[PDB]
Every structure is written in C-alpha cells, then in structure tokens.
Amino acid sequence: KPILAPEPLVMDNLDSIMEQLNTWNFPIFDLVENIGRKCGRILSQVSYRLFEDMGLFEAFKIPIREFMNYFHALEIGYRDIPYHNRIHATDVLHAVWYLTTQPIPGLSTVGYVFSKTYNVTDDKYGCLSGNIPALELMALYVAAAMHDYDHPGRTNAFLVATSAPQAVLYNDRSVLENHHAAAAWNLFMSRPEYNFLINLDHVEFKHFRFLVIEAILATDLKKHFDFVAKFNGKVNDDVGIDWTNENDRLLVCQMCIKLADINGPAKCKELHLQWTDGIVNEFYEQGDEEASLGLPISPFMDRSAPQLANLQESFISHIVGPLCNSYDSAGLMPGKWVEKIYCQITQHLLQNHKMWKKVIEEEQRLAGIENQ
C-alpha cells in the first residue's frame, strides 16, 4: 500500500554516466532520457550515488533499503509540472553536493567526512566538508532533495491572491516552503519503513530535523535580500567566518542552498535554455489559469505576449547576481588557480547575461525600427 520501492535497489544501466558527476555541468537531461522516463527514479539514484560518495551509509549506519523507500516515495511525491519537478530536485541536490565537496582555492579546513575522490593533496584547496560535520551535510542534502515537494505549480503570490487553502492554512507567510517541509516530513513519519534515521540519538534527530526545516525555509525568494545583507554583514566587517559557530555554519548552508535552487543561469547555454523553457512554461500555465478567474494577468506570464528575455535578464541581474557576488566575496566559490583564479560559475553567469542582453537589445532595436 505505501510506496515501497522498485525491485532492484541500485539500477546499473546508468553506470559510466555518474562517473561524470564531479563536473559542474552534469548532463542531467541526458540521464533523464537514459533512465526510464516512464516511471522516474532519478532522484533516488543520484541520492544513492552522492550518499555513497560521502560515505554516510557508514558514517551514520543508514539502512539502504529504507533510504531508497523514502526517497522513491519522495520522487513519487513531486508533481508533474514543467519546472518544479523531480528533475529540478535532482539538479539542486547535485548543485549543493558539488558546492560542498569540490576544491575551493584558499580554504583552511580543520565527525567530518569528505567526498569519495576529492584528491586531498595540497593545503591551498579546502572543501566545505572540511568545515562542516557530517550531520549538517546530511541534513543539507536531504533538505535539497525535499524542498519543492508537491509543488502546486503556482507561486506564493498567486496562492495569496486567490486566497488558496494553502494560503489560509499558513497565514500567508512563506506558504509554499512551509507546505513543502510539512508535507515531506509528514510523509516521512507516516510509515515505519521510511525511518532511515533509525540509528540516531534523540538530540541528534532533533538537531537534524531543525537543520532540515531551516534549510528548506531558506529557499523562500521573498527573504532573498535579507539573506544577502546578512551574509554581507557577516563576512565584510566581522572577523570573517568562525566555523566553530553554529550560527555561521547554519547561515552558510542556508546561503549555499539559496544559491543552489537558483542555478539555471550558471550552467552551459543549452542547460540554462532548457531550464528557462521549463520556467516560462510554468508561468504560462499559471497565467492561463489567472486570466480565467477574472484577475488581471501577471507580468511575464502571458504566452500571447511573451517577454522571456526581459524576465531572464532582470532575473540574472537582480537575483542571481548579488547572491553569487556575496557568496564569492567570502571566498567560498569553487574554482582553480591560474599558474589569478578561474571560476567557472561566474564566467557562465556573465556569458548568459550578455546573451540575454543581446536578445533584449536586438528586439528593442527591431521594434523601434518597425514601429517608428
């Protein structure tokens, strides 16, 4: 009766593709089509690979069967919509894993667990696993895996506008994120075979639950500039980052998942174009419903008058820009030296922003020509 699992736990046709999982531009849609897209068990497989890499199946003695049970039930939980679906959650999980277990130039490390490979040889390269205990990272990964659970396909402002029951039920204060965390944890505690945290302490499980819920609640876009200003003020004039603080580690994981959930405009051009296609389709669905209820149609959400490039340029300039700036100025972005330093992420960001600025300029130029 409960969503239990598929028969063989770790399917193996998707070998030699998870090997190229230590690269920032993971070909996620290739794996999606490779895996049977009929059913969808991508989230579970990528989660198993990542957790085996970190070694958390020995660092906490998590029984792999109940683990797969829970996460397959989770991926079944994700609705079938254009953007916020299980492919997106696998994206965000991989993004946080990469950001926390890949070499960071100029980071001084100090129970902790490192990535499987990681090539620990020098001192000028740190990783976030070398500053954050295993419990915090396991919490962060599970937070990323279940962070858009049962997404209705609408935004917070829409649910607040139409006064949806999810809006009344949560008092119009981060409706969707409360819903995601609530529904996910409910489903977790429902069955007994889902408890992949069976070998934890009372206090350990309490802390884990607290961190998971905090992480999921961090991805509320309304509280974006607040998080950015807090992370600026805590790296700019202070002593920097005292990693022994639990407040600092919490804020760092919150910023990390903030940056991971919005990572369309930080990959190669085709991947970002696919994500943008998804998000525009979802906005078009919402606008379609919104025009039918009599409400004035939302900006950017009119498939009969699209302003896609406007949206993407403004987004990259206002949302992902300052966030990546604050995340990098604190010297945490993963990159490499130059025998000063090369960072792939911000370069991709600049390239995509320039591309959308091309599209905007050309469109306005042609329209001003034709319409005089």
């Binding site: 917070n156 974006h224 500039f225 200003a229 600026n232 700019n236 959400m301 820009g321 300052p322 306005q364």
Partner: protein, 567 residues
Amino acid sequence: NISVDLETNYAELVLDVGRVTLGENSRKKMKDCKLRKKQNESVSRAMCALLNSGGGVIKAEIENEDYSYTKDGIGLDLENSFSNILLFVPEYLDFMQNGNYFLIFVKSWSLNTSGLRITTLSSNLYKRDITSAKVMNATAALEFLKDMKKTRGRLYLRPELLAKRPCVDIQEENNMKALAGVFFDRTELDRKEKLTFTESTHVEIKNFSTERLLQRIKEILPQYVSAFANTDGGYLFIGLNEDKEIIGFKAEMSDLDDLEREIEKSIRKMPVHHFCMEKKKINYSCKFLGVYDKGSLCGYVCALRVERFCCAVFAKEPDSWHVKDNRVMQLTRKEWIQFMVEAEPKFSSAYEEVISQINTSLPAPHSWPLLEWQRQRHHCPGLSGRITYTPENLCRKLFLQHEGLKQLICEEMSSVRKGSLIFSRSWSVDLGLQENHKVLCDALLISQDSPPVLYTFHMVQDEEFKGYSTQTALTLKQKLAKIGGYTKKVCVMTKIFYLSPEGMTSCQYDLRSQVIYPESYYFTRRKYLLKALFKALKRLKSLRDQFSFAENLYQIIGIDCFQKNDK
C-alpha cells in the same frame, strides 16, 4: 563682518572676509597685533561657517601690494588656526590665488570615527584640571555632554557617609578642600601671614595687583566659575601672592558692594543648559575678609565659593557658526547641544543595505550594480548601451515632443565612457526650492570623470536663467555632501540650452569654461555619487522614479516596495 558674496559665478557659497594680509614675513612683520588677530578670527569664522554647512569658498582681498604665495606662503597664525579646527588640512582645504584675490576652497564636514557632527572654534566649556582651568576641546566636550545626557543629569554622591577607613596620618586633596572650607568662614585675616594649603582641583589663587581689578575680574572670573561648576565645585581667592603671603588688594568701602554687584551680574550672565528635571541656578556665594595688619585695615580679600553644578555651565555661547540663508550666523546654544548630543537616524533597510553594499568593489570585477539598471536599452541610435537614461517615462515623453532634444542629448553624450543622466520635470522642486515655470526640464549627468553637470533646458528668448541654474547646482552640491554622505570634494557644473522649435543649439551658458577649481575637484567617483544621490533623494522624500530597479520581477516573486512607512 562676513558677507555671502552674491556676485560670483561660482555654484557655491562664497564668503567675503574683507581685506587680508598674507605671507609669513608679511604677517610676522605686521605692526598691528589687534588687526592681525581680527583678520585671523574673521578667516576662522568663515572657515567654520563653511565647514558646518556643506561646502563653500572663502574669498579674501590681498591686502599687501605685491603678493605671490609661490614665494610667500600663507602665514603661521592662520596655519595654526586651520590645523586646530581640522584634523587633516590637505583633506579639506585648497588654497588658490586668483590675481588680486586669495580663494580657499572648503570641503564639507563629514561624520568620521570621532563622532562629531559639527565643528566648533571653541566649545567654551572649561574644565578644571589638577591646577589649571582649561577649555574642553571638541572630543572632550562631546564625551562630557553625552555622559550627562545619558544619566539625565550629572551623578554625585552627596554626603551619605564617610567611609570607615583606618586611622593613619594620610594627606589628600580633601585636606586642601577642608582647609579652604575653614579659610572661607574666617572673619578676619592677619596681613602678611602664611597659608597652610595650596591650590588644587578645588582651590585656586589669584594675585591681581591691579588698581582697577574690575575690568580684570569681569573677564577672568567666568572661565574659573565654569571650571569649578563643571567639576566638583571649589573656592577662588583673590588678594594673595605667589608665595602664599596674604596681602589683599587695596580697596576702600563703597566699592566692595560694586564689586559684588558686578560679580553677581557676571555669573548670572553665564549661560547654562540642563538635562535634569528641575532647572536650578548656579549656586554660589561671595565674601570679603579684612587683612588688618596690627590695628588697622590694610585692605580686603574677596573669597568666592562655587558649588558643583548638575548640568553644563558655559563661559559664553559655544563658538560655532553656520550660514543659514545669508549673513552667516552663530549657532544658538540649543542647536549646538542638539548637534553634539543627538545621533543620525540611519535606518538602512535590507534592500538599501544590499543596494549600497554592491559598492564594495574590491580588486575584482564585481559586476551587477543595481543603481545602474534600465528596461529601455535603446537610446541614441549610434551608440552602445553605456548611458542609463533613468526616469524612463519622463525621458521618453520629453523625447517624443521637443524633437531637437533627443538629438541634442546624443550630440552631448558622445564623449563619455560611462555615465547616467537623470531627467526631471524640475530639479529645483526635487530639492525643496522655488520652481520657476519657464524651465522646460533638467538633467544630471554623472560620469566617471567630468564632475556632474546640471543641464537646464528651456525655450524662452528673453531671460538668461543663470540665477536659477546656479542656485539649483549649489543646493544639489550641499545636499549631496550633507545628506547623501558623500565624503569627497565636489563641484556641480552647469550648462544652459535654448530649445526653440526647429533648432536645438545656442548653449546660452557653460559654467565649466568660466570658473576654475583646484586640481582635485575634477575627479569624481560616480558610484559614491550615485549612493549619495539615492540617499539624498530618499531623505528629501522626493525619490519617485530615478534608479529604476523594475518591480515586475519583484511583484512576481513576492518582494515588496523599496522602502517607506506606508506598509
């Protein structure tokens, strides 16, 4: 006096300090000490008045005939005064001789780590050191007044108990205080007797072997009264000599009443400012004692006892100036203490925090500045996207009509690497000023080099509009430096244009090829000017559409308006 020179083509406050000698050797060999002190004081008044109210420029007519400044310098008294009013002289002052005029360009005072918000030639709050009554500098006066304002008074420990200390022969200042207390009530003094005590933080002694003694007391008493009332109270004896031999001053009867009257008048004239509930007066008391040698009265010794006060006591009004509208005035006592005691509001919401903190700009690219954004990225056909025409609806409409305007703006904006001009229906009303309806529109070009310019456009072939434009540029400069918090030297240049139909030319005025500034006023920074303009418009409550940061994405995401007490 000091008069605001309304007859200059400068976009600034100009003060005329009258004739002024200059040069180290010309000042040194100047055979009129009172005149020299008066000139130095006039220049210092001018400089303080300029520092307290935005920027400004001091214009002094060279008094000596052949003056160079390139083989003469300025002087040494003026340099002493300058170095006293400021910490760093090169950061605030520029000196430039213009033929037969010596111009001093004064930056505006800025909030620094010291905490001071205005400059003062002298606080006039004296404090009693171990032995001497000194005047509080700016920092000590700040600390004193803020500690007092904190406790809503000034905390004393009135005689609840003498502590139970061991018995042992020990000597302290309270010994001198008590010996003075016994000296004060003595009914008679034997002439040429010795004293058992000397002067300390509660005791002062003056010779004053003066035939008049009243013109001297009238000028020396208030500073010692303030020194006492501002610390622990004390006694002030007159008629003694350095060797502690009581001599007194040869005064006959019918003058002691006059002297007491003048003393009471003088001490009642001294200002005072309370931070306590009640408002006392300066509790004090005088007295006179005979110095009878053997059977006859040789003279008297006026003994004055001053009790410690509950709030601050000035010798005169604080020496702080400012130019209000014209006729540079002195800050009243209440305004002075409000500038010394209160803080700045400094709200700084989270959105504004990130909008500013985009301005960190380490040795790295740090792209994505939010105060330089725009939707319509197609203006001025032959060009790149390197100029943000900000209002975006006022500019579009102003370009629709007034066809020559867009072409003129293109032919103006050609020689600029990167800037951002900001139109307006009228900038005078955006700075809280009188609008004149003949002004078509305005602008504000803020580029990297080439300090900001205030274009004024109009189509009227009768007037000149120099007064309007210069007043607006002056006010914008002052508002920037005093409210936006820009901490560097600035000049707001000017340009005027005529815009008759069928023709867009005839720049009726160009302020840059009319007036010279020091070498440093020509290098602005263009990102801190943007922060300063943002904060100035916010603080003036005229920020409406400048700095687009379009909300169509904010409305989707669920983020609210920029900032106000309206939601």
